[PDB]
RNA sequence: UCAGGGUUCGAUUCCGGAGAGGGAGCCUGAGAAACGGCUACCACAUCCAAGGAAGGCAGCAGGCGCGCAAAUUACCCACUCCCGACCCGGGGAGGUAGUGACGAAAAAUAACAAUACAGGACUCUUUCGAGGCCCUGUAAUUGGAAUGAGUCCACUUUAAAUCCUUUAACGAGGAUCCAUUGGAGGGCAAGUCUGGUCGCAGCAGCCGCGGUAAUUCCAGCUCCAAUAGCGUAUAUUAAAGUU
């Protein structure tokens, strides 16, 4: 709706090669607008285009019109690739981690202990 | 009677009238049941001469 | 007073008190423990055990009435009590030789009321209370 | 982790003179339950305790100063003392009335419109009002000395500007489609 | 818990200690008299082709038993830290959800006018009487207004999700979108109302109520207290200058 994004922290954090601060967002309407669109309007306020910011955070104040997160902006790609968490990466896609999870990893362990110099016959087993 | 089944319960009980008339109406809770408790005690203007009367009575 | 008062006579004070505290009533019952060992409960709250037979107790004068209690032995202590039954007409709501939850009666070892030997009063008859069987809230499970 | 229990009950459960007193204040101030009287009544007796303490002890120890400085300038922010007093022995003339009177809904009342204190708890509840920019729903407030002057409608509300009511704009759209051929 | 002086409790998140069915012995290692290491006895209990073999949940879940008395065979290494040859692996430690009226904090169950009677200050009038103001309940309908409880698209939350906060659209007329728990002789705030029972049945912590007019029983009506809580049993402190 109406859509108001301030500057507050501002910090050039040069050993993990990136600018952080924080997210202070005005909106008299509907507050929370989606951080899709956060990201836009961030990318056109020092031109840095819309790969290497990320934001989170962003828990609404009772009674609305105001909501507050903490966001990043990274110098190049590869430099957020590195650093990044891998849930932040994956939130909006470039990676993943394939978890089957969990039980099949454990379940596989314990067999694979019974058996010696074959490693691949348990996981063969299904 | 003092005898009849004297020795065995149910004798006021099983051996009276059965009433159910109730009625129907919305009391007041929390906040009100306080408002009506208050101003039906002591504000309506309440007082009259040499009163003594309780907050019930049958006369 | 009538008693020492100086300044090095610690010993003989709080040896003194420590022996003429066990005269007192209460902490006798306390300290010595001998009241759990002689109580049917092992000093909880309630109990629970399995009914014997009913019985009528006759109140102490100058009051008549027949108090239609029961007897009760114990699962945790094997031992009998006579437990008073509450309300009216809740005899009927006890079927022998099935199970009951026991209760003191408020007055910690003493017999209430107009009753003698009787200590006790009962709850639940088959996890179901004589609150709610008296009021119609639930009902017995044939 | 960390808990209290805010209030206190009567040492005696039953005396007409004392039920009559927590009655007729219950009344002036439009409080739900009698909890609601005797934490404000904690409040009170907690600040008194307090005080008792640092009446005794010579002026000019540290402890004396430090505290009462500070203690009474929490009185003073609030409001429930003058400046024109600021002694610790005014801090024991303090009484129950004037808590009551700096809260939201008393303050409601009395600096914005209502037509009785019980219309004023309803409106903090129902969000019609703010205090400077924020919605509140706590007429227990306790107002600050300086902020009894910034109590407003909200500022999106159908009191003040902002959005008809679902009372409203069902008996406008009554107009076409409840009654208007249909 | 408590004025002052005390009394009672401390299995339980921090710190220290002891122990892994009961006992004893011992290997490896810097560090162990280790038990999710080993060896033997004693007590248990399992498989077996009866020749032999294998075991220790006071780890997380779960079951039996015991009792007055106590939760899910859930999700995950993202956080916090730890371990490894190591930025990369692993961790029922730990974090997350479920069950949860132990307990604690917040506070909904209707607010405002009209009519209707009702009161009293006030005014006029010689009284009579009238006017008129301040408020009150109380009936009848209503009238306008308001809101979350819920239902529910969407953002958000996070490891992924729930919840919460944020937001569409629906969502209140008292009959329903229903507050109960105890008590009303005295202690102790509240009825000599009506019917039934008539030392029977029952009530009663205590004192006592019931024998044909029951202020105490069984019900109805009415009223009082506390209020999302209240009652009952037991331990324990204050009350106790009755240690």
Redesign the pocket.
């Known amino acids: 709706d109406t859509v108001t994004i301030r500057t507050r922290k501002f910090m050039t954090n040069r050993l993990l090669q990136r600018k952080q601060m924080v997210i202070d967002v005005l909106?008299?309407?509907?507050?929370?607008?989606?951080?899709?669109?956060?990201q836009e309007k961030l990318a056109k306020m020092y031109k840095t285009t819309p790969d290497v910011i990320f934001?989170?955070?962003?828990?609404?104040?009772?009674?609305?019109?105001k909501?507050t997160?903490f966001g990043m902006i990274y110098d190049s790609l590869d430099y957020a690739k590195?650093n990044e968490?891998?849930?932040?990466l994956?939130?909006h896609g470039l990676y993943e981690?394939k978890?089957?999870?969990?039980?099949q990893?454990?379940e596989r362990?314990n067999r694979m202990k019974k058996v010696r110099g074959t490693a691949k016959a348990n996981v063969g087993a299904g | 009677?003092?005898?009849?089944?004297?020795?065995?319960?149910?004798?006021?009980?099983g051996?009276?009238?059965?009433?159910?008339?109730?009625?129907?109406?919305?009391?007041?809770?929390?906040?009100?049941?306080?408002?009506?408790?208050?101003?039906?005690?002591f504000?309506?203007?309440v007082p009259t001469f040499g009163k003594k009367?309780?907050?019930?009575?049958?006369? | 007073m009538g008693k020492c008062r100086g300044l090095r006579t610690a010993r003989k004070l709080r040896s003194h008190?420590r022996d003429?505290?066990?005269?007192?009533?209460?902490?006798k019952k306390?300290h010595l423990g001998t009241?759990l060992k002689a109580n049917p409960?092992?000093?909880?709250?309630?109990?629970?055990?399995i009914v014997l037979e009913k019985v009528?107790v006759e109140?102490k004068?100058?009051?008549?009435?027949?108090?239609?209690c029961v007897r009760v032995q114990?699962?945790?202590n094997g031992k009998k009590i006579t437990a008073?039954?509450?309300?009216?007409?809740?005899?009927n709501f006890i079927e022998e030789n099935d199970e009951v939850?026991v209760?003191?009666?408020?007055?910690?070892?003493?017999?209430?009321?107009?009753?003698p030997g009787v200590?006790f009063?009962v709850?639940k008859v088959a996890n179901v209370?004589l609150?709610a069987l008296?009021?119609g809230?639930k009902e017995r499970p044939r | 982790?960390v808990?209290?229990?805010?209030?206190v009950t009567?040492?005696?459960?039953?005396?007409?003179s004392r039920?009559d007193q927590?009655?007729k204040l219950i009344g002036e101030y439009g409080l739900?339950?009698?909890?609601?009287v005797?934490?404000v009544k904690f409040t009170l007796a907690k600040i008194r305790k307090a005080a008792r303490e640092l009446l005794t002890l010579d002026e000019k120890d540290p402890r004396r100063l430090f505290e009462g400085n500070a203690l009474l300038r929490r009185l003073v922010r609030i409001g429930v003392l003058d400046e024109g007093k600021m002694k610790l022995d005014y801090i024991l003339g303090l009484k129950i009335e004037d808590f009551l009177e700096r809260r939201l809904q008393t303050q409601v009342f009395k600096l914005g419109l209502?037509?009785?204190?019980?219309?004023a708890?309803?409106?903090?509840?129902?969000?019609?009002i703010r205090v400077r920019k924020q919605?509140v729903?706590?007429?227990?407030?306790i107002v600050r000395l300086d902020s009894q002057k910034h109590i407003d409608f909200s500022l999106?509300?159908?009191?003040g500007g902002?959005?008809?009511?679902?009372?409203?704009?069902?008996?406008?759209?009554?107009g076409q489609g409840g009654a208007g051929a249909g």
């Open positions: 909106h008299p309407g509907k507050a929370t607008v989606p951080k899709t669109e956060i934001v989170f955070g962003f828990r609404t104040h009772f009674g609305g019109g909501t997160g590195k968490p891998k849930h932040r994956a939130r981690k978890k089957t999870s969990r039980k990893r454990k362990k | 009677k003092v005898h009849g089944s004297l020795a065995r319960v149910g004798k006021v009980r051996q009276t009238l059965k009433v159910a008339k109730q009625e129907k109406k919305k009391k007041r809770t929390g906040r009100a049941k306080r408002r009506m408790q208050y101003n039906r005690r504000v309506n203007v009367k309780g907050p019930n009575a049958n006369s | 008190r003429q505290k066990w005269h007192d009533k209460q902490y306390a009241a409960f092992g000093g909880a709250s309630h109990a629970k055990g009528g109140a004068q100058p009051n008549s009435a027949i108090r239609k114990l699962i945790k008073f039954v509450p309300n009216d007409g809740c005899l939850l209760a003191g009666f408020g007055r910690k070892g003493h017999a209430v009321g107009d009753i200590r009063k709850v209370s609150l008296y009021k809230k | 982790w808990c209290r229990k805010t209030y009567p040492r005696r459960p039953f005396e007409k039920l927590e009655l739900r339950n009698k909890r609601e005797w934490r209502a037509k009785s204190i019980h219309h708890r309803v409106l903090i509840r129902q969000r019609h919605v729903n706590i007429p227990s407030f999106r509300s159908p009191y902002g959005r008809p009511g679902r009372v409203k704009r069902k008996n406008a759209k009554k």
